[PDB]
């Protein structure tokens, strides 16, 4: 049963994000963020015209969140901090004590209940005052991000020892690649999304160096980043289809991980070269991909204590090019599809492909020299229901695959937090797609959290530290 047992030091828990759960969007001095703006001004972008104005009301109900974490037996709770709740103006001139108090209250409640906090600094909720300067495409945000992080380390770092600078910049950069999509819903594909990535990488590096310089000696924690990546399986066994899948990994994960996690640093060569060529062919004087200087390459490489991975699904990749000119997908040189045979979820993008998780973990091991990997998200959507057999099976299969990666393949996976502790505001999908292991009644002002079967099974896994016999192959 070795392949079915978690390593003794491995950390298990669950995850949320601030805008998705907190509500209290303008309470007690909190400033507006880009998701307040999107859901208020553009309800036509969101299923049901839903907003995060209340969500799970975790601003008021944080003790209930801790209660269900304790019931689950979580060792770690991954949550994010709302930048505009702490710094309502985005800049560090005004610190909102109500926000400081709130996160201290949550942290202290967690620790009093034997649960370790893991904090994501940025999970998509940029202060609107900073978006008004251009947001992530404007490199001035890297210093603003450093200053935000300093406030977080100063106030919380005596008790928080696990930090993620950013969550899914591959996703939030896409808020600069569509007029109707992710906040801030700006249509600069192939140009502004790359600028956003560039700023984020710079920001991440500044935050890491800040920790080294101002906090690490006293606080003794670890700083990483959470990167999402889909497995990309060759549509056929050809060398050409394999090349396309390598392109996919480099254009999705490598975009962020090559600058940070390799000895060489910088963007992947294929990313630089394909965008350079495409830009020239379209008549641009300058490549659409921003450049790092040698000094910047050296500053950015090595800025990590672990790699956070968000894993959900797989795609099929074949040789070719598609998408609009200009765009990151077109630049990436792969044609992406889904296999009809893969089980479905309530989310168009998410098919159940558990073996893809093991393949991805091996790809990461080989590319980045087996970094410590913390799975910061993994989970499954349905439309509702407590007898969530699909979710149960998603978890048991993904955990089995991860355990094979650890035990059979030697991948240094160090922790895992299920997405999500409870049903929450699923971005443009509103409350229509359910990812929780706890259900939440969004028509009940008290927002009760109630366990699904998946919460019961995960509790059993966390308690026994193994995959139960009935779920084994
Ligand atoms: Cl074949
Ligand atoms: Cl049994
Ligand atoms: Na402060």
Domains and CATH numbers, the chain: 1-473 (3.20.20.80)
State in Å: Cα 471 to ligand 2 middle. 8
Residues 245/334, Cβ–Cβ less than 8 Å:
yes
State in Å: Cα 89 to ligand 3 middle. 14
364's torsion region: left (phi>0), alpha (psi -120 to 50) or beta?
alpha
Please tell me the distance from the alpha carbon of residue 431 to that of residue 243, in angstroms, as a whole number: 38
- The angle at the Cα of 121, spanning 118 to 126, to the nearest 5 degrees, equals 150
Query: 388 is written with which tokens?
Result: 């969530």
Please tell me the distance from the alpha carbon of residue 399 to that of residue 357, in angstroms, as a whole number: 9
**Ligand number nearest to the C-alpha of 234:** 1
| Residue 34 main-chain phi, psi, to 5 deg | -65, -20
Please tell me the distance from the alpha carbon of residue 345 to that of residue 422, in angstroms, as a whole number: 17
State in Å: Cα 102 to ligand 3 middle. 14
Angle 97-112/141-156 helices, nearest 10 degrees? Answer: 50
Helix ranges, 1-127 (H): 18-21, 34-41, 58-72, 83-86, 97-112
Q: Are strands 413-419 and 116-122 parallel, antiparallel or unpaired?
A: unpaired
- The angle at the Cα of 183, spanning 416 to 292, to the nearest 5 degrees, equals 75
State in Å: Cα 231 to ligand 1 middle. 18
Which of 77, 108, 64 is closest to 14 using CA atoms? Answer: 77
Please tell me the distance from the alpha carbon of residue 79 to that of residue 455, in angstroms, as a whole number: 18
Our CA dihedral for 86, 88, 90, 91, rounded to 10 degrees, sits at -90
Q: Are strands 314-318 and 335-337 parallel, antiparallel or unpaired?
A: antiparallel
**Ligand number nearest to the C-alpha of 93:** 3
* Sheet containing strand 314-318, strands side by side: 231-234, 314-318, 335-337
State in Å: Cα 402 to ligand 1 middle. 26
* Sign of the torsion formed by the C-alpha atoms of 141, 150, 116 and 204: positive
Which of 46, 71, 101 is closest to 425 using CA atoms? Answer: 46
Please tell me the distance from the alpha carbon of residue 165 to that of residue 81, in angstroms, as a whole number: 11
Which of 12, 50, 106, 16 is closest to 429 using CA atoms? Answer: 50
Contacts of residue 63, defined as CB under 8 A and 6 or more positions apart, other chains included, come to 109
State in Å: Cα 238 to ligand 1 middle. 6
Asked about 179 being catalytic, the answer comes back as no
Catalytic residue among 168, 360, 377, 397: 377
Please tell me the distance from the alpha carbon of residue 199 to that of residue 106, in angstroms, as a whole number: 30
Please tell me the distance from the alpha carbon of residue 274 to that of residue 331, in angstroms, as a whole number: 6
**Ligand number nearest to the C-alpha of 239:** 1
| Residue 383 main-chain phi, psi, to 5 deg | -95, -5
Please tell me the distance from the alpha carbon of residue 21 to that of residue 449, in angstroms, as a whole number: 12
State in Å: Cα 452 to ligand 2 middle. 19
State in Å: Cα 287 to ligand 3 middle. 40
Query: 205 is written with which tokens?
Result: 């590096």
Our CA dihedral for 128, 190, 177, 264, rounded to 10 degrees, sits at -60
Which of 382, 225, 231 is closest to 312 using CA atoms? Answer: 231
**Ligand number nearest to the C-alpha of 470:** 2
State in Å: Cα 98 to ligand 3 middle. 12
**Ligand number nearest to the C-alpha of 155:** 3
State in Å: Cα 236 to ligand 1 middle. 4
CA distances from 330 to 189, 317, 453 (A): 10, 13, 41
Which of 352, 353, 351, 348 is closest to 429 using CA atoms? Answer: 348
**SS3 at position 428:** helix
**SS3 at position 18:** helix
**Ligand number nearest to the C-alpha of 157:** 3
**SS3 at position 262:** coil
Residues in the chain: 473
CA distances from 84 to 25, 56, 228, 372, 417 (A): 9, 18, 24, 31, 25
DSSP string, 256-287: HHHHHHSSS-SS-HHHHHHHHHHHHHTT-SS-
* Sign of the torsion formed by the C-alpha atoms of 195, 201, 207 and 209: negative
State in Å: Cα 146 to ligand 3 middle. 13
Resolution in A: 1.0
Cα-only R_g, the chain: 21
């Amino acid at each position: 049963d070795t392949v079915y047992t978690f390593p003794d030091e491995f950390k298990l828990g669950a995850a949320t994000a601030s805008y998705q759960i907190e509500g209290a969007w303008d309470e007690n001095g909190k400033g507006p963020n880009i998701w307040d703006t999107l859901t208020h001004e553009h309800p036509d972008y969101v299923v049901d015209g839903a907003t995060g104005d209340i969500a799970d009301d975790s601003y008021h109900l944080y003790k209930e969140d801790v209660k269900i974490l304790k019931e689950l037996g979580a060792q770690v709770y991954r949550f994010s901090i709302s930048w505009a709740r702490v710094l309502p103006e985005g800049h560090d001139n005004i610190v909102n004590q109500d926000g400081i108090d709130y996160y201290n209250n949550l942290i202290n409640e967690l620790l009093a209940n034997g649960i370790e906090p893991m904090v994501t600094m940025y999970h998509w909720d940029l202060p609107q005052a900073l978006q008004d300067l251009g947001g992530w495409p404007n490199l001035v945000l890297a210093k603003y991000s450093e200053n935000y992080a300093r406030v977080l380390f100063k106030n919380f770092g005596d008790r928080v020892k696990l930090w993620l600078t950013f969550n899914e910049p591959l996703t939030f950069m896409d808020g600069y690649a569509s007029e109707i999509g992710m906040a801030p819903s700006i249509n600069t594909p192939g140009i502004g999304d790359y600028l956003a990535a560039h700023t984020v990488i710079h920001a991440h590096a500044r935050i890491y160096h800040l920790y080294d310089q101002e906090f690490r000696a006293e606080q003794g924690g670890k700083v990483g980043i959470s990167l999402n990546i889909n497995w990309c399986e060759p549509a056929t066994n050809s060398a050409e289809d394999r090349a396309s899948c390598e392109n996919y990994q480099q254009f999705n994960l490598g975009l962020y991980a090559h600058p940070i996690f390799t000895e060489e640093g910088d963007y992947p060569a294929v990313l630089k070269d394909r965008v350079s060529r495409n830009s020239a062919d379209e008549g641009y004087t300058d490549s659409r991909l921003p450049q790092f200087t040698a000094e910047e390459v050296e500053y950015i490489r090595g800025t990590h204590d672990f790699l956070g991975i968000n894993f959900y699904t797989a795609l099929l990749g074949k040789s070719g090019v598609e998408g609009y000119e200009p765009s990151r997908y077109r630049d990436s040189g792969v044609i992406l599809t889904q296999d009809a045979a893969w089980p479905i979820s309530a989310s168009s993008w998410l098919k159940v492909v558990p073996w893809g998780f093991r393949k991805e973990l091996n790809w990461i091991k080989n590319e980045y020299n087996n970094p410590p990997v913390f799975i910061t998200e993994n989970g499954f959507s349905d439309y509702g229901g407590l007898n969530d057999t699909g979710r149960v099976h998603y978890y048991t299969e993904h955990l089995k695959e991860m355990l094979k990666a650890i035990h059979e393949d030697g991948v240094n996976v160090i922790g895992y937090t299920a997405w999500s502790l409870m049903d929450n505001f699923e971005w443009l999908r509103g409350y229509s797609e359910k990812f929780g292991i706890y259900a939440v009644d969004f028509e009940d002002p008290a927002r009760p959290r109630i366990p699904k079967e998946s919460a019961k099974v995960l509790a059993e896994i966390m308690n026994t530290r193994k995959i139960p016999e009935r779920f084994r192959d």
